[PDB]
Symmetry: C2
Subunit: 171 residues, 2 copies
């Protein structure tokens, strides 16, 4: 440790894109690609967010730009998103695409479908957020997806993303 | 919001260096510069870390490399570090430089001088962490500094860092 943190990768077969997901959603964090919201919203205050694959809501912000989330509007219910940590590929399936106002901070609650809850989450979600409409920032386009598969990396890379090679996740 | 986070800048007059500090201390977070540990260690588990200037321990990891923390060993008690958020320049003064083992996670506790505490911190620290010795990772070089001044940015940039211009913190 010091530091002991890992990063994740995100793959989207539908748009044929993938990124390393950095931590944080500040301007410098997401300048070049998507970032993970380190905290989830609850009525009682902000709490540490789910790590990749874990119960809660792993939420990712990315700019509405060519190399990042321009095409998030193309995702439909059923579509697969894969989140990779050091150990596993986690396959999530899109359950909802919606448009919200920028103050709908509910969408990054541990359970975005029960944001007023104060109990521990039991379901693992992935949430993608970007600016909406295209060439505006009046709103946010939100994609929520639910964990459907956990594949240990020992078993190799899922076929749907096997062509998505790195150039170069843990220290 | 969505996202509503900000980033910070870190200035070190002694070595004449400055960076935008990103969120997170994963390999992708700190590939090109220093990053903020999003969570502080406590005996009862990880808790959200201090934001810039705030009670707790704002801790920053940086590689022991030329453009980042190579020269952290040159810092001495009394030396100034400035942390900038959207509103203020926060001047911390180095109180301790030490070498620890890699698993000394205590150094990122909200009060690194009383890591077993389970109380709310009252003092604002800044901690820098890097690999030690040079060209090794057997140890970590730790600099802890304590908040001595909060200057609203409306008053202009302190003389000691006024020459340290950006090329280009909030969304
Ligand atoms: Cl549009
Ligand atoms: Cl050395
Ligand atoms: Na990224
Ligand atoms: Na980051
Ligand atoms: Na940085």
């Amino acid at each position: 440790p010091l530091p002991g943190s890992a990063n994740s990768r995100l793959y989207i077969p539908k748009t044929d894109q993938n990124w390393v997901v950095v931590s944080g959603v500040g301007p410098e964090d997401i300048k070049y690609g998507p970032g993970w919201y380190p905290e989830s919203w609850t009525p009682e205050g902000m709490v540490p967010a789910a790590r990749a694959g874990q119960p809660g809501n792993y939420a990712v912000a990315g700019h509405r730009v060519a190399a990042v989330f321009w095409d998030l509007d193309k995702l439909e219910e059923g579509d697969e998103l894969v989140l990779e940590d050091a150990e596993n590929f986690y396959t999530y399936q899109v359950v909802e695409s919606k448009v919200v106002l920028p103050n709908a901070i509910e969408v990054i609650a541990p359970d975005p479908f029960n944001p007023e809850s104060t109990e521990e989450p039991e379901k693992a979600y992935l949430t993608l957020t970007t600016c909406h409409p295209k060439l505006q920032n009046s709103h946010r386009l939100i994609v929520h997806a639910e964990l459907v598969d956990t594949r240990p990396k020992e078993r190799g890379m899922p076929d749907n993303i096997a062509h998505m090679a790195p150039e170069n996740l843990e220290h």
